[PDB]
């Protein structure tokens, strides 16, 4: 069981295209709260907090449209 990889998420907002890899983690017994995860192209790793409207909007601005997943 892998608990939330980020005890403290990103509260400050930031532009999404900088993120080179935006992958979110689902919730379960390991962690009831959902946790987002991104990897800035500069070589940084910051988990986002879905409590804000910018983190959920940033995820849609990056994962917008539906392809096949």
Q: How many domains make up the 3D coordinates?
A: 1
Report the helical percentage: 10-25%
CATH architecture label: Beta Barrel
Biggest sheet character: 3 strands, antiparallel
From the alpha-carbon coordinates, what is the Rg to the nearest angstrom? 12 Å
Order of helices and strands: EEEH
Instruction: Quickly name the level 1 CATH class.
Output: Mainly Beta
Report how far the terminal alpha carbons are from each other: 23 Å
| Assembly category | monomer
- Specify the structural class: alpha+beta
User: What is the count of helical runs?
Assistant: 1
Biggest sheet strand order reads: 1-2-3
Kindly estimate the percentage of residues that lie in beta strands according to DSSP: 15-25%
Shape: globular
Question: What name does the CATH topology carry?
Answer: OB fold (Dihydrolipoamide Acetyltransferase, E2P)
Please tally the β strands and state the result: 3
PDB class: cytokine (chemotactic)
Keywords: cytokine (chemotactic)
Assembly: monomeric
Entry title: NMR study of monomeric human interleukin-8 (minimized average structure)
